[PDB]
């Protein structure tokens, strides 16, 4: 199974395969580039998450953003009942995921931040 | 990881300016943000610089930070010194999962002339030796600013073990005093030609020596 | 305003345990990282532990990894530091901080609370004379006592000029030592008696020690 999300680490990880990738050790200090994920399916059965080699802001994916600054809880944002939260570790690599099964009332978007040194990569998810 | 190294102390007169360095031992000082913290005596720290050169609210523009990518060093600069600027200052930088602090720098805003320490060194008493013990007592008083460094010699060889040294404490005449004790055995006291207490204050070093002699 | 009110430390014997608290107010507790930073008396800042917004990330240095545990209770807006297997090297003033993770710095600090790890018990000092070699210095050594303080006088209060009683050193044995020195005219070394009076009330210790010139 694939994780619909972004791998910002430079490890060649086997436990986890993401749909998108963007090596954080590439962008300018105190700047950001985005790695966007769009999901559009009738009834889902997907894992969503990221692999961050620095620090994750906020505490995704229980907390997500709306430079973002509005911290929100994912259960309130997607407004679905059963959301499974998962995590993994590979040294400094931090893998935070969430599983989503079923239908979604309203199309919702949210952002999660991977920060490494002065460089921060954003991951914005849209789900219809 | 890395280390951040600051000078032990700096000093200047009111209204003058002072700069405190923070040299990163390995890696690039420009890779991670540097922050600076002020700590007045007996107080909790407060942030005066964050993100290399940003000032929190409440910090006047007399404070400023800069980053030197060639010397791999960050700097805090304080101009138009006031008495309340007298503090210990710490630089800080963060790498993933590790928080690194500089050693700290004493800033003395001079309120009197610089003053050399008066140093007295006492050898172990006959009483203490008969109790099968040996202590060397090195008394340091009347120095300003209140920053000193103590080292002990066995003859001319450095002594690293058995050394207990107090921090400077403010006297009644606003100068500072300190003390350093070297515990020895009676044999290593008698089996050397002399021991030495080396006090360094503001770059000038004062030395006193005592020998295991009866007379 | 933002507040970090730290709660209650104390004295612990080595290998004991102790819990520190930090009550936070004025900001959304769930949206910030928080840290503990300590400082041994006379020494520098040393980061102890950090915790992310709601526990997603926790960081420790190896000096406390396995012995200290950071946690937080968002329903009480409180940060905790659970300290176990305490060593004497853990003696420090522990500070509570709020962090801005995005800018890698501590933007607010607590007032601090002192934590002392000592196995020392009450013990009176041993007093030794520091004999003198136009003016001469003499004194007496007050050694291995607990707890503070210790008062020293010379000649029962008759001699107070030229007297200097230095602050104590805290040894790694947990015991204190200090020294009192008095500068006297060398011409009186043969004719004036010098007795230092050392008093340590916690142990009902009173010592009169005469400091004589060396016979040689």
Residue numbers in the entry:
A (entry chain P): 293 to 358, 365 to 426
B (entry chain L): 1 to 9, 11 to 27, 27A, 27B, 28 to 66, 66A, 66B, 67 to 106, ...
C (entry chain H): 1 to 52, 52A, 53 to 82, 82A, 82B, 82C, 83 to 100, 100A, ...
From the paper:
Next, we sought to humanize mAb 85RF45.1, introducing as much human sequence as possible while retaining sequences that preserve the binding characteristics of the antibody. In all cases, CDRs remained unchanged. To characterize the ability of mAb TB31F to recognize Pfs48/45, we solved the crystal structure of TB31F Fab in complex with Pfs48/45 6C to 2.6 Å resolution. As expected from the preservation of CDR residues during humanization, mAb TB31F forms similar contacts with Pfs48/45 6C as mAb 85RF45.1, with slight differences primarily attributable to flexible loops in Pfs48/45 6C and crystal packing contacts. Here, we show how humanization of mAb 85RF45.1 into mAb TB31F retained the exact molecular mode of recognition of Pfs48/45, its high-affinity binding to the antigen, and its potent transmission-reducing activity in SMFA. Importantly, both 85RF45.1 Fab and TB31F Fab bound the antigen with nanomolar binding affinities and the two mAbs inhibited 80% of oocyst intensity at similar concentrations of approximately 1 µg/mL. TB31F Fab also retained the ability of 85RF45.1 Fab to recognize Pfs48/45 with sequence polymorphisms in its epitope. TB31F Fab shows thermostability throughout a wide pH range, whereas 85RF45.1 Fab is more dependent on pH. These desirable biophysical properties for TB31F, combined with its retained nanomolar binding affinity and potent activity to inhibit parasite transmission, make this molecule an attractive biologic for malaria interventions.
